């Protein structure tokens, strides 16, 4: 069971900035670059938008801590 497009779109999104600390998306194991769109879950773990959105279309938990995304 996944989330709807509306529930996914309600999750916060940010653009990786020029001054931001480097992180790696755990889904694609690729380090972020400037301009990347990142989506953060209520548990504060964040991913590439396209990476986590694909997982959440069929699942409802965080890939890292396995907490439910919805209330």
């Amino acid at each position: 069971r996944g989330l709807t497009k509306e529930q996914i779109d309600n999750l916060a999104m940010r653009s990786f900035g020029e001054n931001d600390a480097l992180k790696t998306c755990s889904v694609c194991i690729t380090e972020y670059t400037e301009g990347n769109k990142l989506r953060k879950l209520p548990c504060s773990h964040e991913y590439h938008v396209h990476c986590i959105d694909r997982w959440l279309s069929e699942n409802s938990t965080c890939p890292i801590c396995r907490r439910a995304v919805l209330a």
């Binding site: 755990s26 889904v27 694609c28 194991i29 690729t30 997982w55 938990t61 890939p63 890292i64 396995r66």
Partner: protein, 149 residues
Amino acid sequence: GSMALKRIHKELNDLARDPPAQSRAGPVGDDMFHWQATIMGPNDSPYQGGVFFLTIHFPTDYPFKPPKVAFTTRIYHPNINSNGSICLDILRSQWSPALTISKVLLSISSLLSDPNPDDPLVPEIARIYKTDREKYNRIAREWTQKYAM
């Protein structure tokens, strides 16, 4: 499987640069979605001295679906059956796209050191593991000698 292929190559390169202590894995031939793995028997286990072969087949939508991992070497273990199937939650309901093959291999090694008789894929071996531990150790050593050495 374009995105899957890139992650498979990434994992293969990371395994080559930082090899895990008791395990190795890589494609058999030119099929990047089909790997062979070898796991050395843990020293604190009746599988000590044995080398256990496994197959790993990545689905086209990896890592959003788990890889199919199965033993090809016969082994006496309550969580591994005669088809090589492995009763490991992270290979089934608990799969996550943040998991990697190297983490799967480490978890399998821990399963060899510490079987879970309360999730019995082979109920008869789990029964013997619960009721006669030295008999389990003897047979596991016998199978390691016959099949894994």
